[PDB]
Each structure stands twice: as structure tokens, then as C-alpha cells.
Design an enzyme around this catalytic site. Sequence first.
Site, PDB file in Angstrom:
ATOM      1  N   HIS A  62       0.807  -1.217   0.000  1.00 14.43           N
ATOM      2  CA  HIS A  62       0.000   0.000   0.000  1.00 14.43           C
ATOM      3  C   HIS A  62       0.859   1.294   0.000  1.00 14.43           C
ATOM      4  O   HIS A  62       0.346   2.354  -0.365  1.00 14.43           O
ATOM      5  CB  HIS A  62      -1.068   0.095   1.102  1.00 14.43           C
ATOM      6  CG  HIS A  62      -0.616  -0.226   2.492  1.00 14.43           C
ATOM      7  ND1 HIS A  62      -0.829  -1.455   3.063  1.00 14.43           N
ATOM      8  CD2 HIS A  62      -0.098   0.553   3.469  1.00 14.43           C
ATOM      9  CE1 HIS A  62      -0.401  -1.444   4.314  1.00 14.43           C
ATOM     10  NE2 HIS A  62       0.040  -0.231   4.587  1.00 14.43           N
ATOM     11  N   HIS A  92       6.299   6.900   5.970  1.00 14.18           N
ATOM     12  CA  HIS A  92       5.827   6.532   4.658  1.00 14.18           C
ATOM     13  C   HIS A  92       5.176   7.757   3.999  1.00 14.18           C
ATOM     14  O   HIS A  92       5.010   8.775   4.608  1.00 14.18           O
ATOM     15  CB  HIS A  92       4.832   5.387   4.741  1.00 14.18           C
ATOM     16  CG  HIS A  92       3.599   5.752   5.490  1.00 14.18           C
ATOM     17  ND1 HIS A  92       3.483   5.594   6.850  1.00 14.18           N
ATOM     18  CD2 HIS A  92       2.455   6.352   5.079  1.00 14.18           C
ATOM     19  CE1 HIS A  92       2.316   6.084   7.251  1.00 14.18           C
ATOM     20  NE2 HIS A  92       1.668   6.543   6.194  1.00 14.18           N
ATOM     21  N   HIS A  94       2.134   9.180   0.944  1.00 12.04           N
ATOM     22  CA  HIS A  94       0.984   9.049   0.041  1.00 12.04           C
ATOM     23  C   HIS A  94       1.226   9.981  -1.174  1.00 12.04           C
ATOM     24  O   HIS A  94       1.747  11.056  -1.005  1.00 12.04           O
ATOM     25  CB  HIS A  94      -0.307   9.379   0.761  1.00 12.04           C
ATOM     26  CG  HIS A  94      -0.483   8.618   2.027  1.00 12.04           C
ATOM     27  ND1 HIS A  94      -1.183   7.428   2.058  1.00 12.04           N
ATOM     28  CD2 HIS A  94       0.081   8.761   3.254  1.00 12.04           C
ATOM     29  CE1 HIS A  94      -1.139   6.945   3.287  1.00 12.04           C
ATOM     30  NE2 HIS A  94      -0.356   7.703   4.019  1.00 12.04           N
ATOM     31  N   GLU A 104      -3.247  13.551   1.494  1.00 16.36           N
ATOM     32  CA  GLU A 104      -4.448  13.117   2.226  1.00 16.36           C
ATOM     33  C   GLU A 104      -5.169  14.297   2.837  1.00 16.36           C
ATOM     34  O   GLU A 104      -6.342  14.504   2.557  1.00 16.36           O
ATOM     35  CB  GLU A 104      -4.063  12.094   3.258  1.00 16.36           C
ATOM     36  CG  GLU A 104      -3.444  10.825   2.592  1.00 16.36           C
ATOM     37  CD  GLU A 104      -3.668   9.600   3.431  1.00 16.36           C
ATOM     38  OE1 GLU A 104      -3.259   9.566   4.625  1.00 16.36           O
ATOM     39  OE2 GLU A 104      -4.263   8.664   2.869  1.00 16.36           O
ATOM     40  N   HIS A 117       4.171  10.988   6.274  1.00 18.55           N
ATOM     41  CA  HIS A 117       3.699  10.612   7.589  1.00 18.55           C
ATOM     42  C   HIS A 117       4.814   9.987   8.394  1.00 18.55           C
ATOM     43  O   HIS A 117       5.340   8.927   8.005  1.00 18.55           O
ATOM     44  CB  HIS A 117       2.505   9.657   7.481  1.00 18.55           C
ATOM     45  CG  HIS A 117       1.276  10.309   6.925  1.00 18.55           C
ATOM     46  ND1 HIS A 117       0.201   9.619   6.380  1.00 18.55           N
ATOM     47  CD2 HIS A 117       0.953  11.625   6.854  1.00 18.55           C
ATOM     48  CE1 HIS A 117      -0.712  10.492   5.987  1.00 18.55           C
ATOM     49  NE2 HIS A 117      -0.288  11.714   6.272  1.00 18.55           N
ATOM     50  N   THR A 196      -5.019   6.455   8.568  1.00 13.78           N
ATOM     51  CA  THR A 196      -5.759   6.702   7.327  1.00 13.78           C
ATOM     52  C   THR A 196      -5.757   5.478   6.446  1.00 13.78           C
ATOM     53  O   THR A 196      -6.229   5.529   5.297  1.00 13.78           O
ATOM     54  CB  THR A 196      -5.179   7.904   6.520  1.00 13.78           C
ATOM     55  OG1 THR A 196      -3.826   7.651   6.116  1.00 13.78           O
ATOM     56  CG2 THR A 196      -5.164   9.222   7.311  1.00 13.78           C
ATOM     57  N   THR A 197      -5.215   4.386   6.946  1.00 15.69           N
ATOM     58  CA  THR A 197      -5.436   3.083   6.351  1.00 15.69           C
ATOM     59  C   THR A 197      -6.072   2.166   7.367  1.00 15.69           C
ATOM     60  O   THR A 197      -5.974   2.369   8.595  1.00 15.69           O
ATOM     61  CB  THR A 197      -4.078   2.472   5.937  1.00 15.69           C
ATOM     62  OG1 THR A 197      -3.213   2.602   7.061  1.00 15.69           O
ATOM     63  CG2 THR A 197      -3.432   3.318   4.836  1.00 15.69           C
TER      64      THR A 197
HETATM   65 ZN   LIG Z   1       0.107   7.601   5.973  1.00 14.67          ZN
END
Ligand SMILES: [Zn+2]
Length: 258
Positions: A62, A92, A94, A104, A117, A196-197
Amino acid sequence: HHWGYGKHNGPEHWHKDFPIAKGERQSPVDIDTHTAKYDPSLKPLSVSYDQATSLRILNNGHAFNVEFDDSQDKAVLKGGPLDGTYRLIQFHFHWGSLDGQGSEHTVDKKKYAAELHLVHWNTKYGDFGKAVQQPDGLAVLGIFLKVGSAKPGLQKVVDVLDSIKTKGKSADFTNFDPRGLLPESLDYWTYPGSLTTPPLLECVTWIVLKEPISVSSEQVLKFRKLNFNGEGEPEELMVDNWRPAQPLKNRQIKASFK
Ligand SMILES: [Zn+2]
């Protein structure tokens, strides 16, 4: 049929397996800058990343995570709206298929090209898995990326991505200094929210920095060459791995600055 970011398994589906998807303190959100309340009671953040030990980078299907040794207080976040010490476990990103989306969180509805993040957990709970079960268990520092000039401190990350292209792959990734990813200013907005996952637990104090960092188009291009799939299943590019903004509901965003 695991969760992901496609048409048939993407964020609008997550609530069927993770009913907390429709909960009261979901992330991300739109930060309305005229409605955020300056709170002069908020202290400056204290980032002590001088002793950080990175271990490994991995593609988990992901995103890619850079993981740190969190067995002692070596890279920690304190101060701000936090009580106690929060240890860095992983970072990580996004990002999008194009430069005009990827973040996000949004700021007055503006999307950035990506979002970093830095995930920290509250040492009073002894480990990350116990921390995620607590309303004050995690603190995530979110940093926006815009496309312009190259960020030299990110290059070491971009160069290894070739070696973790597909899901499940990992590589040794020692002596990376996360201080090379911070902007100049540590002014921030903060609000209580969620991962957020999946599993989307509502255990996060979000600290979102006002000032974005710049990366080059060539640097973000390399993120987009990664794969959601494992070796060699059909090739699906790892792009648009962001969740859209969720309802603020009964929450106030506070700002450290005016
Ligand atoms: Zn994240």
C-alpha cells in the site's frame, strides 16, 4: 478481496470490513485555515531525531515504509499538544498519479503532490500494538510535498526504490537521517483523528506542518514506478494511495501560529 485503492476495493468500500470508517474521528480532513483556532497555550514541537536508527525499507503493498529501531528513546517527538514521549517507528508517503493530487490532508481544499507521515507511539503503552488501542496512543507528523526544487535528503530514499518494487520486498536501509525531510518552520495545525489506512483506529493526534517541502518532478516520478502487486503478478502502478477528506464532525482544528 483485500482492501486497497482501486475501483472495487478502494476507500469508499473500506467501511464494509472496518465499520469505524464512518466513525466520529476519521482522518484525513480539510484544514480550513480561517476556521482553525490559534491556541497560544500550544507549545513548540520538540523533534529529537539526532540518534535515530533506520533499519529497513519495505513495500507492504500500500506504500513503502522506512522502519526505525524503537527499542529505546532514540528518535522522539515531544511537546506541542502532546503529553509524554512518542517514539518514531516508521515513515511513509501518500502520492498521486499526477502532481495536482496525492496528499491526504488538504488546506482550504488545495491538494499537494504527496504527503509524508512520520508515525510515533506513546512510550507509556510499552509497544505500538498496545498504543493503537488508546485515544492518545499515536502522534503522526504530516508534511506536504510540492513539486519544484529537489530535496537532497530524500534522494537516498528514491535511489533504493528500484530494489523494493513489488509487494513484500524489503531492503536494508541504515544510517538514514530523517532530519533531511523537515521544513524550516515547525508551525503546525493539530486535531484528534485516525490512521488513514485500515484498521483506521481512532488513536492519533495529528500534527500537520504548515510549511511544505519541495521535491523535484524526477523524485516523485520514481515513487510512481512502484507496484501494488507482488512479483510477477500483473503490473499495477502504486499511485493515488491516498484517502479522501472525511467529515470533521464535532472537532476543532487548532493552530500553533497566527
Ligand atoms: Zn500515511
